[PDB]
Design an enzyme around this catalytic site. Structure first.
Site, PDB file in Angstrom:
ATOM      1  N   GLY A 293       2.068   5.274  15.423  1.00  0.00           N
ATOM      2  CA  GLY A 293       2.599   6.634  15.255  1.00  0.00           C
ATOM      3  C   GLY A 293       4.092   6.629  14.924  1.00  0.00           C
ATOM      4  O   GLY A 293       4.606   7.730  14.600  1.00  0.00           O
TER       5      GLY A 293
ATOM      6  N   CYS B 245       5.795   4.945  12.479  1.00  0.00           N
ATOM      7  CA  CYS B 245       6.183   4.828  11.048  1.00  0.00           C
ATOM      8  C   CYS B 245       6.993   6.038  10.615  1.00  0.00           C
ATOM      9  O   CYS B 245       6.668   7.195  11.025  1.00  0.00           O
ATOM     10  CB  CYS B 245       4.985   4.640  10.130  1.00  0.00           C
ATOM     11  SG  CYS B 245       4.159   3.075  10.515  1.00  0.00           S
TER      12      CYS B 245
ATOM     13  N   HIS C  94       2.837   4.955   2.315  1.00  0.00           N
ATOM     14  CA  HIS C  94       1.524   4.511   2.821  1.00  0.00           C
ATOM     15  C   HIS C  94       0.871   5.624   3.622  1.00  0.00           C
ATOM     16  O   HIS C  94      -0.297   5.430   3.976  1.00  0.00           O
ATOM     17  CB  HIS C  94       1.610   3.155   3.535  1.00  0.00           C
ATOM     18  CG  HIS C  94       2.143   3.200   4.927  1.00  0.00           C
ATOM     19  ND1 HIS C  94       3.264   2.484   5.286  1.00  0.00           N
ATOM     20  CD2 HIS C  94       1.669   3.770   6.062  1.00  0.00           C
ATOM     21  CE1 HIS C  94       3.490   2.646   6.581  1.00  0.00           C
ATOM     22  NE2 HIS C  94       2.527   3.426   7.090  1.00  0.00           N
TER      23      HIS C  94
END
Ligand SMILES: *[C@](O)(C(=O)NC1CC1)[C@H](CCC)NC(=O)[C@@H]1[C@H]2CCC[C@H]2CN1C(=O)[C@@H](NC(=O)[C@@H](NC(=O)c1cnccn1)C1CCCCC1)C(C)(C)C
Ligand SMILES: [Cl-]
Ligand SMILES: [Cl-]
Lengths: 301, 300
Positions: B137, B139, B41
């Site tokens: 932030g 991920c 993503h």
């Protein structure tokens, strides 16, 4: 979102851990630059742990009586000195993995990470707090002496604790990295009472602010209190006094949540009176006191 | 003595974390050998195949501290992006990719801008969420176990669900739970308590001298499972009984004897008392975690 007992990443400290042997005693040492720091009781025998004369024991040792092992490498001890209750072994090699570091003596209520080690190798990392009676509620077995406590705000490692002993209640005592004990304790096997422990009030309030930030409001009330009336109540539950310094320190979390510090104090007074009645706050059924105001801002923002 | 929520030492994993930037999205990557792994993503503003086709290697900015890595290849595997780089990570530890089961515990290295910020222990919940602690932030932060100098990577962070719990994938990009990497409506299922872990933690309590909840009584797997069902506890299997065997032998408390303790605690509560400083029944320590911590197992 969420709120965990979060430790600092341990890698900067793992690269400093070594094994120190003197006689039949093996424990951990901390290798920074060309010095290994370890508990001075590594030089003691079974026949003299009640009243060791450390100056008399150390003068009898040669550099070659200290075996210092970093992985499968022996380091060469080229000197030794005692600073309070820590032994400093000068070695022939600077640790190439030495991080940016400082030594800091902490105050009761402060938190830090512990890297529990055995034979110079790490077992695990967890969060601790310096209790008001200057003990720590650690997790340490035989062999863990010389394990350290630290913070890593901003790429610099702040060493604040070195592990020396377990008290009869199962809590732990030790020194700063200058070898000064936290609390009234000495490195002797004589009986030594830890003071009655109390709850760290400013930390419990910081955690209630963490709960509000994470969307929990159930424990709030419409009441306020004076600081003096709060302290009269909280002392009856063996809570530490809250000082104007603590009220100032909670100012930013107060501003972020829009709940005045003495309004949150009134919530705490009611929670001590009522308990949780089967509810939880941040997944606890007890009032948590090992998160500081600084720890809440670190994790929540 | 003492019993703490203990994470694995994180040093082997810290040397693998990098920053990945694609367009305006910056998040974390895991750099192993010559491949950086991150959530697919990262390429979003979804048709992932299509979005990826339009990207050249130079669209992916990878930073290991203040050093730029050169991307020479990109592929997708399930919901993970694999960026081939021109340099093998000289800090790559002995590792493998494993997929864990609900109830198993692991350490999370929470990271921001490729920089490790914290480490904590958590459990894969029966509902395939984790109760993590993650901000924007985070991920691409990873979860892991260590088993004698081998790092077993088991989790990569992808998103937060509306209730504030977390969802992600194994390192082969397979989601834990019935989740998708799409902005659509998704919910944590009803969760349950990990029974075998509660029993392990009661053994940890007894090893640490906390004994008040022990009783003369024993039970049957069948009778206890009817009580577990009633209290939204996972079923206790014979395999779970066998796994607790070492703790049974060390403490003198058989598992079905400890089950009769647990039944009484579920039926009666704790009557104002604590266990290992908790007023709740703790279920994020496995039997292996308790043996590990109480015997001082170290990592090479
Ligand atoms: C540490 O040096 C180590 O890891 N050594 C490696 C194995 C070779 C070691 C950690 C042990 C758990 N620490 C100690 O051995 C220290 C040293 C340093 C100061 C005293 C000695 C003994 N010691 C202890 O931690 C002991 N603790 C005590 O003796 C406390 N007393 C009691 O626990 C007690 C219990 N029941 C009845 C009477 N006393 C006292 C309490 C007051 C402060 C000093 C320590 C043991 C018993 C080894 C845990
Ligand atoms: Cl301090
Ligand atoms: Cl803990």
């Amino acid at each position: 979102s969420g709120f965990r007992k979060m430790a600092f990443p341990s890698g900067k400290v793992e690269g400093c851990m070594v094994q120190v042997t003197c006689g039949t005693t093996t424990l951990n040492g901390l290798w920074l630059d060309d010095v290994v720091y370890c508990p001075r009781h590594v030089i003691c025998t079974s026949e003299d742990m009640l009243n060791p004369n450390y100056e008399d024991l150390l003068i009898r040792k040669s550099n070659h009586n200290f075996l210092v092992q970093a992985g499968n490498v022996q380091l060469r001890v080229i000197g030794h000195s005692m600073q309070n209750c820590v032994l400093k072994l000068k070695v022939d090699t600077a640790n190439p993995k030495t991080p940016k570091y400082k030594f800091v003596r902490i105050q009761p209520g402060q938190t830090f990470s512990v890297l529990a080690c055995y034979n110079g190798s790490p077992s695990g990392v967890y969060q601790c707090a310096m209790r008001p009676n200057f003990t720590i509620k650690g997790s340490f077995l035989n062999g863990s002496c010389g394990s350290v406590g630290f913070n890593i705000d901003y790429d610099c490692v702040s060493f604040c604790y070195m592990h020396h002993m377990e008290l009869p209640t199962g809590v732990h005592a030790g020194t700063d990295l200058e070898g000064n004990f936290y609390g009234p304790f000495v490195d002797r096997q004589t009986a030594q009472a830890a003071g009655t422990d109390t709850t760290i009030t400013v930390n419990v309030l910081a955690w209630l602010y963490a709960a509000v930030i994470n969307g929990d409001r159930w424990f709030l009330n419409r009441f306020t209190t004076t600081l003096n009336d709060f302290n009269l109540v909280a002392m009856k539950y063996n809570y530490e006094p809250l000082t104007q310094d603590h009220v100032d320190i909670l100012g930013p979390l107060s501003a972020q949540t829009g709940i005045a510090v003495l309004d949150m104090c009134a919530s705490l007074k009611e929670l001590l009176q009522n308990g949780m009645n089967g509810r939880t706050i941040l997944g606890s059924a007890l009032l948590e006191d090992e998160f500081t105001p600084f720890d809440v801002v670190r994790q929540c923002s």
